[PDB]
């Protein structure tokens, strides 16, 4: 029964600390980012995800001022932050306690593949859009997230809620600053951060959730590349070579190929409107990508506005829908196709 009590600041609301009691710690998760641990909340019995990250006095961190602005269904809630003593002797470390959620795309997606199965389309739709609603809110903002990967995303297998969690490599892009090129999950990096662009944007993102789409239709990475300028011949496989025109919109600062067909890409019977998603969001130059709103309005989510869908297990499906004026400010146009007859 051993209780650790912290003070710590809410996440949202006024900068007042507050006790905050926890029991049964465990780890959960690791990185060079630090550590992530699971914790029950004393008082309302409630499991809660610590991450603990390695912070310097002076400079503020980006990850906090961050994830403290966020309010989001997809995306897992900032409960508290508090500081501590760690693993180094006179270092103060960043605790962020955040919402726990008991599984992830990847777990699943590995789950699968184990057993010689694709993930059933409905939980790739689902999953999907979910991500796609994350998008639109934190690119709102204008924060890129910079590390959309399987990893990453987090879901409840009973309600198939899918929540983002990671923003340790998270960034406001401001245009004309210049951002680092080596970020994201290699597999999942956009071809103008393998260029080396410094000038990009949160188009990003979409081309990460792109390959994360791919990898749950084929049952593995789409791009598995090796280091350097391999990874870009995992993707010229797929795409063929780049001309002259989308490697300047890429990076405005060869072998080539033909581009490979997206049905044989992917498997026989993989839904058209999957592919044709798909297609739309592994593009080369950046502004020929969908919006994460656009994407969430593509056809492959029709599914998830009929009124008769459901989950598997037989429930109803999580909240798709309930889309506030901040979400739809950035195309309020689509909120026809987004918000369907029935839900308004
Ligand atoms: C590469 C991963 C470890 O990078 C990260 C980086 N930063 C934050 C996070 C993070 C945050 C909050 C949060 C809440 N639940 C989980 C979770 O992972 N649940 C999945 C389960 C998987 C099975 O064992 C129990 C945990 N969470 C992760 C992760």
Redesign the pocket.
């Given at each position: 029964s051993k209780v650790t009590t912290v003070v710590a600041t809410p996440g949202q609301g006024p900068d007042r600390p507050q006790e905050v009691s926890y029991t049964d710690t465990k780890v959960?998760?690791?990185?060079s980012?630090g550590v992530?641990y699971?914790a029950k909340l004393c008082d309302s019995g409630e499991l809660v995800?610590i991450?603990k990250v390695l912070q310097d006095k002076r400079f503020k961190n980006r990850e906090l001022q961050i994830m403290r602005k966020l309010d989001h269904c997809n995306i897992?809630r900032l409960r508290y932050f508090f500081y501590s003593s760690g693993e180094k002797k006179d270092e103060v470390y960043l605790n962020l306690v955040?919402?726990?959620?008991?599984?992830?795309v990847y777990?699943v997606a590995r789950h699968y593949s184990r057993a010689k199965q694709t993930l059933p389309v409905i939980y790739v739709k689902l999953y999907m859009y979910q991500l796609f609603r994350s998008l639109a809110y934190i690119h709102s903002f204008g924060i890129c997230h910079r590390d959309i990967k399987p990893?990453?995303l987090?879901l409840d297998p009973d309600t198939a809620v899918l929540k983002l969690?990671?923003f340790?490599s998270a960034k406001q892009l401001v245009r004309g600053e210049p951002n680092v090129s080596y970020i994201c999950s290699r597999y999942y990096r956009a071809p103008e951060l393998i260029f080396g662009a410094t000038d990009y944007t949160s188009s990003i993102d979409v081309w990460s959730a792109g390959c994360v789409l791919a990898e749950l239709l084929l049952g593995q990475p789409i791009f598995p590349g090796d280091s350097g300028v391999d990874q870009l011949v995992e993707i010229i496989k797929v795409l063929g070579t780049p001309t002259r025109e989308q490697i300047r919109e890429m990076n405005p600062n060869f072998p080539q190929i033909k581009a490979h067909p997206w049905t044989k890409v992917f498997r026989p019977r993989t839904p058209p409107e999957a592919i044709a998603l798909c297609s739309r969001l592994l593009e080369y130059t950046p502004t020929a990508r969908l919006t994460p709103l656009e994407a969430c309005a593509h056809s492959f989510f029709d599914e998830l506005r009929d009124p008769n869908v459901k989950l598997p297990n037989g429930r109803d499906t999580p909240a798709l829908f309930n889309f506030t004026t901040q979400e739809l400010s950035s195309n309020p146009p689509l909120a026809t196709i987004l918000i369907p007859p029935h839900a308004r």
């Open positions: 959960i998760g690791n990185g980012f992530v699971q995800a991450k897992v955040l919402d726990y959620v008991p599984e992830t777990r990893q990453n987090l969690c990671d340790g």
